[PDB]
From a paper:
O-acetyl serine sulfhydrylase (OASS), referred to as cysteine synthase (CS), synthesizes cysteine from O-acetyl serine (OAS) and sulfur in bacteria and plants. The inherent challenge for CS is to overcome 4 to 6 log-folds stronger affinity for its natural inhibitor, serine acetyltransferase (SAT), as compared with its affinity for substrate, OAS. Results show that CS uses a noncatalytic residue, M120, located 20 Å away from the reaction center, to discriminate in favor of substrate.
In the case of HiCS, mutation of either M92 or M120 completely abrogates the formation of reaction intermediate (as both 330 nm and 470 nm peaks are not observed), but mutation of M96 has subdued effect. On-rate binding constants of mutants of HiM120A, HiM92A, and HiM120 AM92A are ∼286-fold, 80-fold, and 200-fold lower than that of HiCS wild-type. Mutation of M92 also affected the substrate recruitment although to a lower extent.
Numbering used by the authors:
A (entry chain X), B (entry chain X): 2 to 311
């Protein structure tokens, strides 16, 4: 029916079958670009704010502070705007000027730090701002805030189960904060009782989950797959539900993304191309030929036009 | 469940209540930016192609030719890509270079005409290309192709009826091709038996529907409300279901659009700001205080960032 504000309109994203990936239709994609803010992060921007209200840490008057690497800050921005919260978001001068303006036009009180050290400064500034008056601010902390995976367990997971009628066999998701694969896996494995195969995807340039699980020295490193590869293990990544970890390089993630536009008519971001390249690999293994593979496409295309993707 | 391709995933867009427009919640918006291609036009790109198949004019091998003023060409582009059709789209050198590239990355064989005369050349080229071999091409003709309003009568209309439980009293829609208000109005007035108020919206700069219905000389003229104000009466505009015509100027359409971002957390285009300004006007008339007003928001924000809107 009718949503009280734009925060409630999250989710119910479509599953679509791919024709030029997989084997006789075993790869189906879940299009999270089909959301407010054009990415999966709307789901956690909404729920981290709802939960902060449920527990009283968010009150009719307090101000949201956070630092953001991109999609999340827009999510929180639109939810704050929808629900009428002051929001401060911190980000260095290493930022897109189209990303600055979007945030600003969202009523974000944007904090511009120095580029140099990277995101460690703006994040430090984000705790710094809170440190001034903790009673005035609340930092939502997507990497460790459990409301992040709990929304995927409550929505994104059941949506997958429902739309496939319980027939999903594998789920393929890149990991940034890890909340996606976590919430979904728990949903399907624990609430819906089905021992699916949960596949984490990361960049071959910064393969810290793979290096970790194999006891190998952890060596994070630069990459272009925007949205994943945080370069450490996030607290919202539960390695206990991860069955398999696939790595994908940036160039293949791009080529796959472009390929989805030109052949599938699906316009998604570099991270969505990374996830499909991972799922395609598995789908074309005789052990997965009969199984139903569900791949999360984290974001939509038109918010990557001016980096590499175009 | 699972869509065979991205064309089938159109529609089921949300209704959201506005908090800073209308009077005690009588204005609710339908967010058509929440679609593949990020606009309502995905609905006609999909259906004009489906219907052309139903009637045999589109065959496994023919090529789509059309000229486009923007959103429609992306819609057709993604549907052609999804359904595996060659598409030629014509457009002058008066085009966004980010709009060119999106189309190109969609596998569009783009035709670049001369700017000078405007869109009359690229359209003429679009018939010109067909004129070479009509057996090779098919021109879908959104302004007069009835599959355009029939999709809104089949989907967008019933979605409104269903989500409001039949309680919608007024529908507010800007008119470009007119298919939106047409299909929706017929749906609700004729199929669902309810004598709602259908309100067309146009720019005060090019008020040809208003000048027409009042017998006044028709004087189209330049405007910035992208998506509406075609500067003539389209064949897919049935003035027989239009109860009222509101005009809105470009500056107010912008301000209203920005206002939806900053206060509602709804990121939409200039034409969506035009439609809400029209609906807000009516909503604050004592005669509409009790009635439920539904406003179509035709497109999403991130595809206007680089003109005026930002």
């Amino acid at each position: 029916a009718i949503y009280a504000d734009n925060s409630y309109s999250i989710g119910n994203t479509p599953l679509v079958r791919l024709k030029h990936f997989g084997h006789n239709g075993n790869v189906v994609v879940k299009i999270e670009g089909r959301n407010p803010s054009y990415s999966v992060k709307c789901r956690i921007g909404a729920n981290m704010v709802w939960q902060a209200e449920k527990d009283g840490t968010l009150t009719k008057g307090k101000e949201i502070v956070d630092a953001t690497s991109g999609n999340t800050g827009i999510a929180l921005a639109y939810v704050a705007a929808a629900r009428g919260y002051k929001i401060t978001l911190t980000a260095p001068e290493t930022m897109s000027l189209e990303r600055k303006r979007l945030l600003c036009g969202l009523g974000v009180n944007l904090v511009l730090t120095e580029g140099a050290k990277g995101m460690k400064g703006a994040i430090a500034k984000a705790e710094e701002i809170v440190a001034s008056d903790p009673s005035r601010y609340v930092m939502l902390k997507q990497f460790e805030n459990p409301a992040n995976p709990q929304i995927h367990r409550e929505t994104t997971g059941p949506e997958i189960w429902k739309d496939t009628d319980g027939k999903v066999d594998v789920v393929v998701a890149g990991v940034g904060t890890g909340g996606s694969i976590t919430g979904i896996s728990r949903a399907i494995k624990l609430d819906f009782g089905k021992q699916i195969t949960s596949v984490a995807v990361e960049p071959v340039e910064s393969p810290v989950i793979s290096q970790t699980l194999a006891g190998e020295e952890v060596k994070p490193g630069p990459h272009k797959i925007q949205g994943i590869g945080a370069g450490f293990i996030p607290k919202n990544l539960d390695l206990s539900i991860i069955d398999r970890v696939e790595t994908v390089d940036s160039d293949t993630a791009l080529a796959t993304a472009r390929r989805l536009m030109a052949e599938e008519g699906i316009l998604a971001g570099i991270s969505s191309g990374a996830a499909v390249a991972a799922a395609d690999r598995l789908a074309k293994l005789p052990e997965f030929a009969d199984k139903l593979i569900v791949v999360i496409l984290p974001s939509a295309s038109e918010r990557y036009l001016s980096t590499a993707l175009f």
